[PDB]
A paper describes a structure:
In this work, we describe the structural features of dihydrofolate reductase-thymidylate synthase from B. bovis (BbDHFR-TS), the causative agent of babesiosis in cattle. BbDHFR-TS is a homodimer that exhibits the classical dimeric interface seen in other structures of ThyA thymidylate synthase and bifunctional DHFR-TS enzymes. This 511-residue, 58.2 kDa bifunctional enzyme consists of a di­hydrofolate reductase (DHFR) subunit at the N-terminus and a thymidylate synthase (TS) subunit at the C-terminus connected by a linker. BbDHFR-TS is an obligate dimer, with two arginine side chains (Arg373′ and Arg374′) from a flexible loop in one protomer making contact with the terminal phosphate of the substrate dUMP in the opposite protomer.
Pemetrexed and raltitrexed are folate analogs designed as antitumour agents and currently approved for use in some countries for treatment of cancer. The two complex structures of BbDHFR-TS have two ligands bound to each subunit of each protomer in the asymmetric unit. The pteroyl-like groups of pemetrexed and raltitrexed are parallel to the uracil ring of dUMP when bound, mimicking the pteridine ring of the native cofactor mTHF. Although the ϕ angle of the C-terminal Ala511 in one protomer of the raltitrexed complex is rotated by approximately 30° relative to the other, this has no effect on the virtually identical binding modes of raltitrexed in both TS subunits in a single crystal structure. Both drug molecules are also observed in the DHFR subunit but appear to bind this substrate pocket with different geometries. The bound conformation of pemetrexed is virtually identical in both DHFR protomers but differs slightly from that of raltitrexed, which itself has two different binding modes for its glutamate tail. However, the para-substitution pattern of benzamide in pemetrexed allows the formation of a salt bridge between the α-COOH of its glutamate tail and the Arg83 side chain. This is in contrast to the 2,5-­disubstituted thiophene ring of raltitrexed with no salt bridge to Arg83. The five-membered ring of raltitrexed causes a >90° rotation and a 6.8 Å translation of its α-COOH group relative to pemetrexed. Moreover, the glutamate tail of raltitrexed is shifted between protomers of DHFR in the same crystal, with both making hydrogen bonds to Arg42 but only one contacting the N∊ atom of His33. The loss of salt bridge and distinct binding modes of raltitrexed thus provide a structural basis for its lower DHFR affinity relative to pemetrexed, independent of the reduced chemical affinity associated with its C2-methylpteroyl scaffold.
Author numbering:
A (entry chain A): 3 to 188, 195 to 511
B (entry chain B): 4 to 188, 196 to 511
């Protein structure tokens, strides 16, 4: 074979959403220093055992002539690595080995040039040859969630590869991105099992999210693992709605809001409705028509005549939802009359108070907005699912924890995660703080029985990098945010998954 | 003399007074779980070894008296080579017999194919194995109670350390766990795919660093202490003693198995129980606790604190509309600690206990103490703000949100307190016990507690105790301190920790 002995080459590459890798012999996007540190660390690692036996050993990096010309001259040859250039027009390049083709080079290297591992650093001529001929067994790929103008493209990865590793999602001010590993498709010590004190042979879980992904550092795996856990181990229970659900109690997810915006990528999520709902909460509204007028229908069934009449609200106007979330956030303790009454100056404006306290006393440990107003529960169309939330400041960063008493994992939860993430970013901005973490506590977490097929489909889908959130920096008071001031960039998702509401 | 006789592995079960036998029998009632542990531990063959020789077995060695203490119908122990040491019996059916240990170990390793050798007592054998350094690993079941006995496990030499601890388990009669003693003498992609520095300085503080298998629930708490000391931000707070702080944790405790009263220091249980009873009765009068020799709320009811925080017209120890008031009278107009609130406000505790009985699948089983309208009247707003029950498989669980968590002082009380409350509610509702899930928001260690918590996180946990409530108690208001009993509590010494106000 022409390529006898030239296999197990490892690719590093960074690829835009449209598959572009190069533009006018340069990188098509603004410099991502993080990504270069990742290439460098990836391509210069020698296992400790190998380095102790041959302390001067290095890895090899191979690239095409044009890619060599695309690297700043002061950085060449790439440090701590044997640089190999392929060319049929140039014979000699300072500090590098030069070969006329790949097969010659790999063979020469492995027989005559002691080294550790060989890496392929492009361009497309090389990537294409390496992929077209089965020579690569692993690909380290940086995924960028944006299209870029370009003239040089990464070839399609064959379906013989699968993603086995995904990093957390990162972002610059111009793109969101992550790091993945692709590999070709083709146990714990006994004391671990013994010292659980339980059965040493446990039936493994019936459902596992993305079972081919071994390194699972994308934050969305927290959610997918929860879906799989409830399906695997949840108890089927009746509930208020009349559609039964699989249920399990107590989870805690966290999302680093400085790095990405946690809008699920495993289905297309309706962001516009999330933003409109949040703005409605912030303005204190209990009038469901304010959402219908904006083509947001998420609260419609809970304001309808037949639901109201079914739950004792026979004197309530349609879509008068009672003293729910927004009324509690802005008017806790005020006497609810109807959705048309004037509550200016009535009750306690918790949102205003807490935002002011974050500014004036950030180390306070009572930065809480509470919607569980025990005195008003009976008056609400539905008691709040997201009950309570608390802020925290350290090192000039704002975090938020939220208690969700009841968590419809298929429908509500994805909205709830995005909602509090926006709110936290809004509060951080108006308080001049950076972003910490959103911590989401799930109490009764459940999957309605009519969503099982949808969730089964969803947990097999490989997450894309999360998008990023940009708020208009001119907005200085939380009441002034409008939907045009809240922008999610670089959202790449799998298709929407229809999921029917029980009620 | 013992050349080639090392690396013997001991299994044993030991009571708190070191007793292992009584009248040539086991001193405690039978723990079937413990025997499964023994059987599983001593019959295991690695899969690589088992496929190369499919008939291979481990060896179990015991003294003659231990062999005579095993029911005849179980002998020889199945799937193992049974070896008895004796100078008076020469033949035992189904077994090998030797006159001493060195002879037997040498004969076995030279002439009797086998996998691993286990030492199953008695004290004549354990004493020989330990005195002569022949053991490298000990699987030991720790029982938290003393038993009458006449046969004792020898002291384990300080050349051994505990390297594994199971969760705590319990029967009706004892709490126990499994531990491993041994002699004191990450693939790159995992580092790369974090996307952060590949060279990561180890945390400055690590709880019980010799323990590698860390299945005791108390490690959740100790790990948090170490995490806050290692990675918490030092910042000011209301008290004027700074604290190291980190945000957002979640612990869980299986209340069916044990009672999570910390064992790494002696915790003042009596005060936890009296405080809980005071909450349940809806009291806001701090004198009701002082009269019972419980002073945990005393500084917060003092004139000096009241007057500095603007409560100049409040009687001393009138704490205002705090926890108990909100539990039993949410929405009532607070006057003072001497007023009658009978039939005023919403009795959340009563309402939720009834709903657990009538509609356990309800998803609003919440008691909330964060009464925004009353916060300004409280001597201190509640630390444990909100709690929520859950029922599945005839078991009650509870989750509680703690806004502010003094890891040194308050948190150990808070864990035990909600554990008792959940057990109490389960009993009056006819349910079993699920889990207590404890959510920590601002979790912190005051600077003057750093020395104390450094001492504490190096202590090896004992098995947790167990809770027994008087079974005759039908209504939550009828529990008295005599009805709430913690059994088998073994702990390290108390650690003094001063309150920052
Ligand atoms: N984002 C990323 O990860 C990444 C990675 C690499 C490169 N890039 C970008 O990609 C662009 C450069 O890649 P490119 O594909 O244009 O060029 P390239 O593959 O780097 O260079 C092509 C040259 O290499 C020689 N060569 C090697 N193998 C060959 C083959 N099989 N057939 C023909 N010639 C071969 C030839 O030089 P002679 O003409 O001397 O024979 C050919 O002209 C730049 O814009 C660079 O910034 C991006
Ligand atoms: N909790 C636990 O894990 C555990 C484990 C084991 C046993 N036990 C309890 O321990 C008690 C029995 O232990 P024990 O200490 O009384 O007796 P033991 O050690 O089992 O047996 C003593 C007898 O075995 C022979 N023997 C032991 N070591 C020998 C050696 N090195 N060389 C020659 N012969 C040796 C001698 O028999 P001859 O007199 O025939 O020479 C000696 O009299 C029982 O109550 C049993 O239930 C408890
Ligand atoms: C994950 C990945 N990201 C990339 O941007 C990338 C680029 C190349 C193209 N090529 C092989 C390059 C190597 C180095 C370059 C560069 O412009 N470097 C900067 C920073 C130096 C460093 O830290 O590596 C410079 O020299 O100024 S461009 C090949 C594989 C890749 N792989
Ligand atoms: C059983 C139940 N589960 C819920 O999640 C729930 C949610 C709300 C209000 N809530 C806050 C909602 C969030 C998201 C929703 C929803 O229907 N999402 C659909 C379509 C979104 C759209 O097109 O606007 C989806 O995600 O597929 S509804 C009201 C009653 C409920 N009842
Ligand atoms: C951890 C441990 N616990 C023990 O109780 C124990 C006992 C011995 C003493 N000896 C080595 C024994 C082996 C088996 C026995 C026994 O009494 N078996 C009962 C119980 C059967 C079951 O529940 O599985 C029997 O055979 O009926 S007693 C040795 C090591 C130990 N190790
Ligand atoms: C800064 C601060 N931290 C607290 O944990 C705290 C707790 C209370 C009330 N609380 C709920 C208490 C729980 C436990 C306590 C305590 O002092 N424990 C000591 C002594 C116990 C005793 O012997 O009675 C200890 O555990 O060492 S105090 C009041 C103010 C506070 N202030
Ligand atoms: O923002 C929301 C609002 C509601 N729910 C879900 C949880 C339940 O499935 C249902 C409310 O029903 P109850 O728990 O109140 O029965 O809606 C959410 O997940 N998020
Ligand atoms: O049951 C309690 C009561 C209080 N605290 C702690 C947390 C804080 O350190 C302090 C209360 O002070 P603030 O958070 O309110 O400032 O007491 C507890 O840990 N548990
Ligand atoms: Cl922001
Ligand atoms: Cl007043």
């Amino acid at each position: 074979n022409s390529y006898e002995g030239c296999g197990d080459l490892t690719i590093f590459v960074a690829v835009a959403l449209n598959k572009v890798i190069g533009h006018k012999n340069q990188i098509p996007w603004p410099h991502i220093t993080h990504d270069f540190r990742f290439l460098r660390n990836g391509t210069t690692y020698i296992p400790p055992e190998v380095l102790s036996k041959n302390p001067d050993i290095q890895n090899v990096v191979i690239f095409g002539r044009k890619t060599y010309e695309s690297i700043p001259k002061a950085s060449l040859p790439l440090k701590n690595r044997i640089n190999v250039i392929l060319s049929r027009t140039v014979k000699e390049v300072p500090g590098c080995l030069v070969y006329e083709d790949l097969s010659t080079a790999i063979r020469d290297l492995r027989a005559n040039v002691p080294h550790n591992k060989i890496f392929i650093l492009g361009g497309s001529f090389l990537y294409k040859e390496v992929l077209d001929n089965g020579l690569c067994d692993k690909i380290y790929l940086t995924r960028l969630n944006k299209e870029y103008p370009g003239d040089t493209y990464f070839p399609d990865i064959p379906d013989t590869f699968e993603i086995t590793a995904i990093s957390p999602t990162f972002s610059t001010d111009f793109v969101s991105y992550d790091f993945v590993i692709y590999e070709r498709k083709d146990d714990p010590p006994f004391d671990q099992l013994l010292m659980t004190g339980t059965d040493i042979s446990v039936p493994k879980p019936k459902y596992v999210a993305c079972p081919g992904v071994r390194i699972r550092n994308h934050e969305e795996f927290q959610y997918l693992d929860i879906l799989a856990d409830v399906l695997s181990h949840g108890v089927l229970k009746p509930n208020r709605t009349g559609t039964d659900a699989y249920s399990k109690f107590g989870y805690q997810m966290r999302f680093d809001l400085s790095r990405s915006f946690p809008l699920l990528t495993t289905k297309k999520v309706a962001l516009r409705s999330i933003i409109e709902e949040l703005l409605w909460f912030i303005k204190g509204s209990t009038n469901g028509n304010d959402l219908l007028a904006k083509n947001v229908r998420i609260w419609e069934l809970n304001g309808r005549r037949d639901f109201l009449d079914k739950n004792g609200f026979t004197d309530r106007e349609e879509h008068d939802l009672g003293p729910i979330y927004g009324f509690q956030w802005r008017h806790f303790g005020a006497e609810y009359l109807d959705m048309h009454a004037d509550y200016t100056g009535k009750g306690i404006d918790q949102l205003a108070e807490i935002i002011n306290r974050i500014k004036t006393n950030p180390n306070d440990r009572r930065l809480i907005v509470c919607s569980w107003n025990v005195s008003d529960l009976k008056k609400m169309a539905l008691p709040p699912c997201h009950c309570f939330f608390q802020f925290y400041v350290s090192d000039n960063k704002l975090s938020c924890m939220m208690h969700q008493r009841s968590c419809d994992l298929g429908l509500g939860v994805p909205f709830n995660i995005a909602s509090y993430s926006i709110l936290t970013a809004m509060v951080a901005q108006v308080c001049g703080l950076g972003l910490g973490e959103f911590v989401h506590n799930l109490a009764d977490a459940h999957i309605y029985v009519d969503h099982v097929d949808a969730v089964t489909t969803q947990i097999a889908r490989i997450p894309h990098p999360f998008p990023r959130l940009r708020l208009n920096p001119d907005i200085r008071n939380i009441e002034d945010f409008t939907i045009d001031d809240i922008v999610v960039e670089d959202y790449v998702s799998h298709p929407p998954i229809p999921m029917a509401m029980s009620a």
